[PDB]
Amino acid sequence: PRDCQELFQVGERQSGLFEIQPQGSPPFLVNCKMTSDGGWTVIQRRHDGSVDFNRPWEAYKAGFGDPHGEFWLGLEKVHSITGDRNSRLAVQLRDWDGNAELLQFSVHLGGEDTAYSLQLTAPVAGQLGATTVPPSGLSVPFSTWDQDHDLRRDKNCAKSLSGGWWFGTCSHSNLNGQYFRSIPQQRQKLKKGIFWKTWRGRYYPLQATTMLIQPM
Ligand SMILES: CCCCCCCCCCCCCCCC(=O)O
């Protein structure tokens, strides 16, 4: 099977770890979530701060963490699953009162020659808060502290925050920031946290996150 949806299509019902082999890729073990709307590959999961997410480009490219716990699957693995296909990206957020927020967006994902850019249509960029986007859409590269794409020579978004992310601004979201259980001395620490601005605010540290992908 090339991905979790293929595993779903052959009849696999259980969520857990399964071997897949995308076109052109070696085989590798992924976390599949089997739902009534098909098979989803889990590409990121955070829930307790046990895994360090402040890593460089090569780690975000290859993947890191605990497949039975918190992890980042790895951009090269994710792009091997998506290829050039239109894909559903599910973003799941949990706050410290147990509320969950479930978002889904249609995306394309470029390969490493695009710095693994998230390619959004203008309506999808609008869903994310962008107001003036041309029909050609928006491309946002991935950035880490050692490979940051902020054009301002004065600035480095990943270094000023924490982790690796599609920093379209430095103020929209970062689900790969530093895990916090409480309010740090200043918004100076929470600035480097796990946030999604339009749900709980720029400096609310989220309790748990999951990101999932389903090509087509
Ligand atoms: C598309 C799925 C979401 C996950 C990745 C989102 C990364 C950011 C890309 C969206 C750019 C929107 C810019 C809004 C700017 C802002 O409010 O600061």
Indicate which technique resolved this structure: X-ray
**Resolution in A for the shown PDB structure?**
1.8
Residues in the chain: 216
Q: How far is the CA of 168 from the centre of ligand 1 (A)?
A: 6
Q: How far is the CA of 103 from the centre of ligand 1 (A)?
A: 12
Does the C-beta of 169 come closer than 6 Å to ligand 1?
A: yes
Same domain, 76 and 56: yes
Name which residue sits closest to atom 8 of ligand 1, judged by CA.
168
Same domain, 77 and 158: no
Beta strands at 38-46 and 71-72: parallel, antiparallel or unpaired: antiparallel
Task: Convert 144-165 to b/e letters by CB count within 10 Å (16 or more is b).
Answer: bbebbbbeeeeebbbeebbbbb
How many helical (H) and strand (E) elements, i.e. helices and strands, does the chain have? 7, 12
Does the C-beta of 129 come closer than 6 Å to ligand 1?
A: yes
- Among 87, 89, 128, 142, say which to mutate for ligand 1: greatest number of ligand atoms within 8 Å of CB: 128
> What atom in ligand 1 is closest to the CA of residue 171?
18
CB neighbours of 61 closer than 8 A, spacing ≥ 6?
A: 74, 75, 76, 112, 116
Measured CA to CA, the distance from residue 73 to residue 162 in angstroms comes to 18
Same domain, 142 and 93: no
Residue 118 DSSP code: E
Same domain, 27 and 110: yes
- CATH number for the domain harbouring residue 178: 4.10.530.10
Does the C-beta of 172 come closer than 6 Å to ligand 1?
A: yes
Same domain, 83 and 140: no
Q: What is the dihedral of CA 104, 83, 30, 165, to 10 degrees?
A: -60
Residue 142 lies in domain: 131-207
- CATH number for the domain harbouring residue 83: 3.90.215.10
Measured CA to CA, the distance from residue 76 to residue 69 in angstroms comes to 20
Q: Is 188 helix (H, G, I), strand (E, B) or coil?
A: helix
Q: Is 198 helix (H, G, I), strand (E, B) or coil?
A: helix
Number of domains in the chain: 2
Q: Tokens 């976390």 sit at which residue?
A: 31
Q: Is 51 helix (H, G, I), strand (E, B) or coil?
A: coil
Measured CA to CA, the distance from residue 207 to residue 42 in angstroms comes to 17
